[PDB]
């Protein structure tokens, strides 16, 4: 039997919230509060109902639980405001109201002397930063205001939280520079201020935050040089400052930090020669300097970084050949150098093959005009993701790729490749994304494609690769580019469009139960569209336009209920345009230039 005062507070609290948990169904007629889901006594001292689909509003009686030490209501659907009495519990040491739909703002008077952790992340809080919470809450170690609508200056105050360890102000709308007082925080080990609108140089006084382990400054409007302060940050492990306007090179002290694991300054304005003392940087495993104006040949000493696993140097202004020293990049797993004026793909491939841990390789927009190596000597045993697109490469499908049995994604589109698509292309048990579009392949489409294991049985299992860099996709040069953080984020895809191909569309394509995009536009295919394409239940996009196909559109295609993109324009088809199911959501354009009769669109004689 719990205290009648807490028993009442709990009842008002849950009266404004649905649905009642396990748990609380008998709350009206019980005194046994200490065993209800979430409660903990010794007087209620904890109340934890995170992730319980709670909907409604925070009752005012919450501030009546005078002995509460933990208040956890994270990950629910609680709207409206936080009651004022909750800002006066004398014993509350952890407050977690993250991931709800809380709104309004934070009071100017707060008195939480016991408070250690304050988390209002992922809500709709508005207004000025609760900086003054450091006045009465002298013991506070964690402040989390991330993902809210806090705007205005990044105001002074947090420097009064002498004991503060985590400060997260990410994804708000803050302006101004980092306030001078914040550099008093001798014990701060996390500072996230990313995804705001902060501006100005990044002060050298950061050297004071000597306890920092993780510093995220990314996605702001900072400018000037990266401050040369990294010898005064012996515990720093993660510097993230991408998408700012930083300039100059990598400072000597950053270039010599033995603790740094990850460095990400992508999308800035860095320049000159890129040097990193790989003898000093013994912990470095991920490096992302893409979209900068570094120049010269690719650094020759990067493989001396013996832990370096993720390397992204894309879209800089390097040039020339992959340095000969990259043979010894023993640790390299993901390597992306898109759009970097790289030369000699015969040499680059012949060298990168030595990196036995290499699983993802992106060389898009490089080697302009050269010839894909035919040499069958090349071996990439662990290769999972190979994107070598838009290089105008000549030659034929590289036979050597056939022994990369773990291949999951292959893009060789927008080249000048010839010959037939070999049949071994269908022996990749883990292949789920294939783009060979916009080349000059000839001959029949190989039947092995129809037997691609990862497209037929929805229980084939493999480990997705985990590069730190994202992948972008544009259908055409104009199209807004799409971001994909995860390899398994890509739709299962067979893209053979814009080639020079002939033969039928094999009936057996009906086997591919889990194919999403099937694109064969702009070839010279013939025969009838098999009724068995209805077997591809997961189809979202089916483009057969611009071929030589004959016969009617199989009326079974109506069963394709995910089908949102569909064209058979510019063929030789005849009969009635199928109606309903998905079909009346397709535009007139999908059926134009045929002998196809409609009912509302394309009449007949």
């Amino acid at each position: 039997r719990c205290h009648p005062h807490d028993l009442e507070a709990l009842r008002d609290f849950i009266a404004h919230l649905e649905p009642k948990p396990d748990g609380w169904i008998n709350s009206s007629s019980s005194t046994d509060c200490c065993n209800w889901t979430g409660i903990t006594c010794n007087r209620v001292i904890r109340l934890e109902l995170g992730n319980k689909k709670l909907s409604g509003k925070l009752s005012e009686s919450l501030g009546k639980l005078d002995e509460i030490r933990v208040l956890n209501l994270s990950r629910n659907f609680i709207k409206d405001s936080i009651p004022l009495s909750i800002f006066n519990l004398k014993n509350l040491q952890t407050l977690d109201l993250s991931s709800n739909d809380l709104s309004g703002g934070i009071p100017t008077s707060i008195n939480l002397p016991a408070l250690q952790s304050f988390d209002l992340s992922s809500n709709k809080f508005n207004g000025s930063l609760p900086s003054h919470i450091c006045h009465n809450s002298t013991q506070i170690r964690v402040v989390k205001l991330a993902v809210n609508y806090f705007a205005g200056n990044f105001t002074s105050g947090f420097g009064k939280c002498v004991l503060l360890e985590h400060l997260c102000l990410g994804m708000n709308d803050l302006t101004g520079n980092i306030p001078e007082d914040l550099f008093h925080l001798k014990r701060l080990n996390l500072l996230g201020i990313q995804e705001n609108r902060l501006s100005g140089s990044l002060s050298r006084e950061i050297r004071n935050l000597s306890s920092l382990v993780r510093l995220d400054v990314s996605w702001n409007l900072f400018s000037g040089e990266i401050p040369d302060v990294f010898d005064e940050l012996p515990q720093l492990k993660f510097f993230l400052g991408q998408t700012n306007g930083f300039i100059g090179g990598i400072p000597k002290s950053l270039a010599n930090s033995p603790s740094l694991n990850l460095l990400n300054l992508r999308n800035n304005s860095l320049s000159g020669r890129l040097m990193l003392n790989c003898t000093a940087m013994i912990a470095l495993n991920s490096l992302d300097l893409g979209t900068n104006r570094f120049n010269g040949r690719l650094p020759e000493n990067l493989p001396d970084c013996k832990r370096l696993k993720n390397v992204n140097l894309a879209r800089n202004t390097f040039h020339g050949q992959v340095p000969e020293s990259f043979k010894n990049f023993e640790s390299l797993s993901y390597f992306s150098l898109s759009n970097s004026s790289l030369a000699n793909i015969s040499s680059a491939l012949g060298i990168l093959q030595h990196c036995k841990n290499l699983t993802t390789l992106v060389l898009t927009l490089n080697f302009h005009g050269e010839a894909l190596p035919d040499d069958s000597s090349l071996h990439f045993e662990k290769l999972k993701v190979l994107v070598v697109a838009n290089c105008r490469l000549t030659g034929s499908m590289p036979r050597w790729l056939s022994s990369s049995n773990e291949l999951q994604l292959l893009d060789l589109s927008w080249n000048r490749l010839t010959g037939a698509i070999p049949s071994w292309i269908g022996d990749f048990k883990a292949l789920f994304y294939l783009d060979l579009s916009n080349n000059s392949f000839t001959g029949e489409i190989p039947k092995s494609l129809t037997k691609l294991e990862s497209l037929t049985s929805r229980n084939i299992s493999v480990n997705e690769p985990s590069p730190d860099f994202p992948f972008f996709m544009k259908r055409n040069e104009s199209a807004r580019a799409l971001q994909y953080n995860q390899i398994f984020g890509f739709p299962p895809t067979i893209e053979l469009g814009h080639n020079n191909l002939s033969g039928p569309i094999w009936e057996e394509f009906g086997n591919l139960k889990k194919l999403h995009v099937f694109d064969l536009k702009w070839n010279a295919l013939s025969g009838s569209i098999p009724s068995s394409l209805s077997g591809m239940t997961s189809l979202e996009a089916l483009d057969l336009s611009n071929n030589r196909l004959s016969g009617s559109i199989p009326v079974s295609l109506q069963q394709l209920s995910f089908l949102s993109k569909f064209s058979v324009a510019y063929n030789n088809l005849s009969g009635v345009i199928p109606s309903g199911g998905q079909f009346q959501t397709f535009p007139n354009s999908s059926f134009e230039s045929n002998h196809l009769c409609g009912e509302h669109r394309f009449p007949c004689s």
Partner: peptide, 5 residues
């Protein structure tokens, strides 16, 4: 085509 940046 897929690229990286």
């Amino acid at each position: 085509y897929i690229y990286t940046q």
